[PDB]
Scaffold this active site. Structure first.
Site, mmCIF file in Angstrom:
data_model
loop_
_atom_site.group_PDB
_atom_site.id
_atom_site.type_symbol
_atom_site.label_atom_id
_atom_site.label_comp_id
_atom_site.label_asym_id
_atom_site.label_seq_id
_atom_site.Cartn_x
_atom_site.Cartn_y
_atom_site.Cartn_z
ATOM 1 N N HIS A 218 0.822 -1.207 0.000
ATOM 2 C CA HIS A 218 0.000 0.000 0.000
ATOM 3 C C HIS A 218 0.860 1.261 0.000
ATOM 4 O O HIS A 218 0.382 2.354 -0.313
ATOM 5 C CB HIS A 218 -0.976 0.015 1.185
ATOM 6 C CG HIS A 218 -0.339 -0.237 2.515
ATOM 7 N ND1 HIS A 218 -0.094 -1.506 2.994
ATOM 8 C CD2 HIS A 218 0.056 0.616 3.490
ATOM 9 C CE1 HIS A 218 0.419 -1.424 4.210
ATOM 10 N NE2 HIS A 218 0.520 -0.147 4.534
ATOM 11 N N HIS B 247 6.602 5.744 7.042
ATOM 12 C CA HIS B 247 6.053 5.558 5.711
ATOM 13 C C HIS B 247 5.293 6.830 5.391
ATOM 14 O O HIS B 247 5.094 7.680 6.262
ATOM 15 C CB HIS B 247 5.099 4.366 5.684
ATOM 16 C CG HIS B 247 3.996 4.465 6.686
ATOM 17 N ND1 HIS B 247 4.129 4.020 7.984
ATOM 18 C CD2 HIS B 247 2.775 5.043 6.610
ATOM 19 C CE1 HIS B 247 3.038 4.321 8.664
ATOM 20 N NE2 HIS B 247 2.202 4.945 7.853
ATOM 21 N N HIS C 66 1.975 8.785 2.977
ATOM 22 C CA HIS C 66 0.656 8.654 2.387
ATOM 23 C C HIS C 66 0.654 9.822 1.422
ATOM 24 O O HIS C 66 1.116 10.908 1.765
ATOM 25 C CB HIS C 66 -0.444 8.858 3.428
ATOM 26 C CG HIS C 66 -0.576 7.727 4.395
ATOM 27 N ND1 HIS C 66 -1.426 6.663 4.185
ATOM 28 C CD2 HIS C 66 0.030 7.497 5.584
ATOM 29 C CE1 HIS C 66 -1.344 5.828 5.205
ATOM 30 N NE2 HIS C 66 -0.467 6.310 6.066
ATOM 31 N N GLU D 277 -3.379 12.717 5.232
ATOM 32 C CA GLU D 277 -4.519 12.096 5.882
ATOM 33 C C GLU D 277 -5.128 13.083 6.867
ATOM 34 O O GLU D 277 -6.329 13.362 6.818
ATOM 35 C CB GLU D 277 -4.077 10.794 6.551
ATOM 36 C CG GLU D 277 -3.561 9.796 5.519
ATOM 37 C CD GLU D 277 -3.536 8.371 6.019
ATOM 38 O OE1 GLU D 277 -2.875 8.112 7.050
ATOM 39 O OE2 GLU D 277 -4.176 7.510 5.376
ATOM 40 N N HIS E 225 4.591 9.412 8.307
ATOM 41 C CA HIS E 225 4.260 8.825 9.596
ATOM 42 C C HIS E 225 5.426 8.059 10.187
ATOM 43 O O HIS E 225 5.885 7.065 9.623
ATOM 44 C CB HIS E 225 3.050 7.898 9.480
ATOM 45 C CG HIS E 225 1.775 8.621 9.213
ATOM 46 N ND1 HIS E 225 1.568 9.923 9.607
ATOM 47 C CD2 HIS E 225 0.634 8.228 8.604
ATOM 48 C CE1 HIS E 225 0.355 10.299 9.250
ATOM 49 N NE2 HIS E 225 -0.233 9.289 8.638
ATOM 50 N N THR F 243 -3.920 4.377 10.419
ATOM 51 C CA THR F 243 -4.825 4.780 9.345
ATOM 52 C C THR F 243 -4.988 3.695 8.284
ATOM 53 O O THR F 243 -5.612 3.914 7.248
ATOM 54 C CB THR F 243 -4.333 6.065 8.678
ATOM 55 O OG1 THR F 243 -3.057 5.824 8.074
ATOM 56 C CG2 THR F 243 -4.192 7.174 9.717
ATOM 57 N N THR F 244 -4.408 2.529 8.548
ATOM 58 C CA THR F 244 -4.518 1.401 7.638
ATOM 59 C C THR F 244 -4.938 0.199 8.471
ATOM 60 O O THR F 244 -4.692 0.155 9.683
ATOM 61 C CB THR F 244 -3.168 1.067 6.954
ATOM 62 O OG1 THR F 244 -2.211 0.672 7.946
ATOM 63 C CG2 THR F 244 -2.627 2.277 6.195
HETATM 64 ZN ZN LIG Z 1 0.404 6.045 8.025
#
Ligand SMILES: [Zn+2]
Length: 259
Positions: free
Chosen positions: A63, A93, A95, A105, A118, A197-198
């Protein structure tokens, strides 16, 4: 193997099927309404002890990508801020969105940035990231906004490894990367109790979203969208967007430091 994704058929709006917590009481991200931000004299300045941070590998997780860090010892930890205890940095990681006007996010008064970094940490009171992720005080993630503007040199080493982890599951050696090179100079921050958030979307995260973004060029952003959600042998699927939209704040309070 990772059925959930960000497509119309498996995106955020469908995660609740396999992960009911998606509709939980402490889901992230959330929009940060600065007008409602609270001042807590108890909040302390963030203590990012990254001096001995030891990056290991960069992995395409299906992802996005993770820059893993050796969290076998307190080599790179996060302390103070709104936290109690020591939290080890395990991976960071990003987003991002399909266009520069979106990707972050968390949002600030509805404002969206091109991307969001993040830095994931876990409470050493738990022995391991997994056990930690099961407790409300288990994880601490520092969110950093990437604002389209000047190209950011510190982001270079990261972008350069992307061609080595194009498809899901592919990894590459990624030594000596200082996670602090991706932090802004001022560490003012907003904090609230939330979740990853995942999926599994566990509500064990003390969110620490920095108010000051770091820069990224439009050209660098094109680079993030060159990755593949798919594993080799499968239909190519570009990682154009991997951000979860703002979730209901509900009965949560966003605190701000120094205010
Ligand atoms: Zn994240």
């Amino acid at each position: 193997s990772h059925h959930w994704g960000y497509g119309k058929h498996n995106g955020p709006e469908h995660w609740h099927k396999d992960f009911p917590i998606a509709n939980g009481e402490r889901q992230s991200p959330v929009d940060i309404d600065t007008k409602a931000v609270v001042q807590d004299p108890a909040l302390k300045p963030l203590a990012l002890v990254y001096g001995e941070a030891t990056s290991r590998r960069m992995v395409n997780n299906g992802h996005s990508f993770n820059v893993e860090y050796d969290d076998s010892q307190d080599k790179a930890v996060l302390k103070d801020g709104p936290l109690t205890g020591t939290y080890r940095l395990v991976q960071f990681h990003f987003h991002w969105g399909s266009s520069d006007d979106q990707g972050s996010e968390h949002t600030v008064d509805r404002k969206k940035y091109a991307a969001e970094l993040h830095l994931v940490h876990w409470n050493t009171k738990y022995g391991d990231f997994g056990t930690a992720a099961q407790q409300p005080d288990g994880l601490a993630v520092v969110g950093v906004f990437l604002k389209v503007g000047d190209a950011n040199p510190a982001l270079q080493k990261v972008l350069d490894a992307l061609d080595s982890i194009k498809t899901k599951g592919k990894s590459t050696d990624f030594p000596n990367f200082d996670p602090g090179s991706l932090l802004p100079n001022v560490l003012d921050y907003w904090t609230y109790p939330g979740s990853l958030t995942t999926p599994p979307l566990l509500e064990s995260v003390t969110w620490i979203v920095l108010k000051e973004p770091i820069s990224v060029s439009s050209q660098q952003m094109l680079k993030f969208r060159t990755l593949n959600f798919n594993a080799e042998g499968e239909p190519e699927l570009l990682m154009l967007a991997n951000w979860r939209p703002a979730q209901p704040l509900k009965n949560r309070q966003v605190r701000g430091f120094p205010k």
